[model samples]
Target: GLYPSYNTSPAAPDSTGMQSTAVQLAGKIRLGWNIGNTMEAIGGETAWGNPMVSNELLKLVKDSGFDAVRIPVAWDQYANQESAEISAAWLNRVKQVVQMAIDNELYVLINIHWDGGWLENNITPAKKDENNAKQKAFWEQIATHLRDFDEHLLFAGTNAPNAENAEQMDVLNSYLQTFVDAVRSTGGKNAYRVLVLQGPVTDIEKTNELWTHMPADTATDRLMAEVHFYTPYNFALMRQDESWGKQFYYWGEGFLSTTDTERNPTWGEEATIDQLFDLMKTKFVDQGIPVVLGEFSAMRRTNLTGDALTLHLAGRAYYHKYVTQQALARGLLPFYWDNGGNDNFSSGIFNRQQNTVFDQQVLDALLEGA
Candidate 1:
C-alpha cells in the first residue's frame, strides 16, 4: 500500500519571509572541503571504511582555514523504501554532525550524493515520478528536521547528476525543481536556505553549453549552480592505464618531468585551466549567478619515491594552488573532495584517525589562494 503524501508531514505552510545577500554569502565561503564516502556509503556510514564523523573532524577543517564544509549524504540508504520514512537514528546522526559543523562556525552544505544513484543516474522519464515521490518525501522529512538552523546551513540539493542530453537535462531540471519545492514547502529557515543545483554531469563545459535556465525557486535569489572539476581525467583520477592513454605522472608547466617526457600532460594545466574557469565567470558570475565548484581533487601518487616523489608532490601542490586561486578569483566557490583517503593514489586531506591535517604542504597550497 502507498503511504499518504506530505499532507501529514507536519511541515509548516510557510516560514517568515527571509532572504539573504546570496551574492555576498557566496563570496564569504572562503574555501570548503567535502566529508565524503562516509554518509554517502552504500550500506552504512561507517561501512565505507572511514571513521564516524565527529565534532573534532569539523573543528580540524575550520582550524585548517576552510570556512565552509560540504557534507555529501545518502538518505535512500536509510529510508523505509515503500513509505519513504527515513531512519530516525540516521536523521538524528546527520543533524548532530551538522550542528557540530555549525558549532565550528563553518558554512555547512548537505546534499543527496550518489546514494545508490537513486535520483542522480536515473534522470529518465520512466523513473521520474517514482524518484520525485521519494524526493518529496525525503526532503519534507529533512527540511523539517533541519529547519531550526539559520543561514550557516545550505541545502545542496544533489551531487553530480549524470545528465548528457536535452531530454536528460529536462528530467534533471524537473528533479531540481522538485527538490526546491519539497524543501520550501517545509518552510522556516529552509525558505531562505541557499539551494545548489548540479550541472549536467557536473561538468563545466557541458553546463556552460547546455544550461539556459535555472530551476525555479519560490524563494528567489537563493540559488546556486553547482559543477565539479577534475579535468584532464588522465591526471586527476585515472588510476590504471587504459588502451587509449597512459596515466599522466606530471601536469602543469614547470612540473613536467625532464627525463620522462611521456609522463607530462599535454593539456588541462594552468593556461587551459584559466580558460575553463573563465567560461564559468562569463556564464554565471557575470550574470550575478554564483557558482559552486562542488568537488575538485587530484590524487597523491605515493607509489614513487626519491626524486620522482618530490617532483610529483610539488606538481600536485601547484595544481591545488592554481585551481584554488582561479576559482576564488573568479568568485566561484571551491570545495576540495576528500574521500577519507590518504595513500598512493588517494585524495585524502585530513587524517581522520588523528583528526589532524595529514598533508600540510598541499593544505597550505590550497590556503595560498584563499
Candidate 2:
C-alpha cells in the first residue's frame, strides 16, 4: 500500500511499442522484498531505526526465500542543495550494496524514493522546469554510477508522484520523461537497462483514469509500470477509527470475525482483488508492458488479545498469500514492504541484524505463491 497517487486502464497513448527492452527475467523476479526504511531515511541509512545494511544483511534477505529486493533509496539529502551533484561517498555506498544483491544473483531495483518529495510533490508548472533540471541531473549521476550491473539492476524514476488532475498528470509525465531521457542518455548498459515509471502517484484507479500518456522511450518492451496496492485502507493500514470509518481487523472471505461484527470488513475481499489485478493484466501485462506491484502488506497489531489476536494474524497472513497468488498469476511481480523491527508498523518479516525470520506465518503465506 505504499504508492498512493496513480494506477491503470488502457495502455498509455505515448508508448511506441515499436522497440522492446525485453524483460525476459520477468518470471524470475518473483517473491520480492523491500528494505523500506533504512536507505530512504532522512539523515542516513540507519537514521530511521534499522541497523546499517551491510553485505550480510543483503545475504540475509536472499537467504530468507526472497528472489529480489526493491531498495528505496534517498539521494536528495546527500546531494548539494543548490545543484544535482550527489556526494561520491554516498553513490559509492549505494553501489556497494547493489553489488551485494547482484553477488547473490538477486534481481534488484533502485529508486529515487520520495527523496524529500522534490520531484514527486513539485509536479506543478511553478516548479516544473526547476525540478526537471534536477531529475535529469540526478539520474545521470545515478545511472552512470551503477551502469555496470547487468539486467538484474533496474532504475525506478521516483516514488508516489502526487498528481490529482489531468493537468497534473501532464506535468508528472514531464518529470517521468525527464527521468527516462536522462538515464537513456547516459549511454552505457543503461541505454538498454529497463526503467520503471511510478504510475501517476502509484494509485491504481487514478492511473487507469488519467494515465493516458507515457514518457517517450527509446526502448519499448523494456519499460515497466509500477502501482502500489494498499487497497481497502480501512483494513490494510488504518490504525485508528475516524468519524468516517473504523479500522478493519479481518479481511478476505474465510477470515472475518464472527463475534465482532464491527471489526469485519464488508468490502475489499477476494472478488475485489480478482477485479483489481485483472485490470493490470488486461491493460498492461497482456499488452507487453510488465507491471510491478511495488508494495503490499498488512501490519501486525499486537494490541488485540484473545481469539481476536489469532484471527487478526490469520487474516493478515492470508491476505498476503492470496495477493501473492493473484499477482503472480496475473504476471505482475509483487514485492512485500517492511520497515525492519518487531513493533507495529514494522511489516518486517526478516530481522536484518540477526539474519533470521521475524514472522514465520507471514513469510510462509507469501511463499505459498512461489
Maximum-lDDT candidate: 1
Cα displacement (angstroms), candidate 2, residue 221, comes to 2.3
- What is candidate 1's lDDT per residue for 26-77, written digit by digit as tens? 9779789999788888878888779999888888888889999989899887
Worst 10 residues of 2 by lDDT: 1-10
Location of the lowest summed lDDT over 10 successive residues in candidate 1: 9-18
lDDT of each structure?
0.85, 0.83
Write one digit per residue (lDDT tens) for candidate 2, span 137-200: 7887888788667888889998899999998898888989988887777666666778888887
What TM-score fits each model?
0.96, 0.93
TM-score of 2: 0.93
On TM-score, the leading prediction is 1
Off by over 4 Å in 2: 1-21
Q: Listing every candidate in turn, what is its Cα RMSD in Å to the true structure after a full C-alpha superposition?
A: 1.7, 6.7
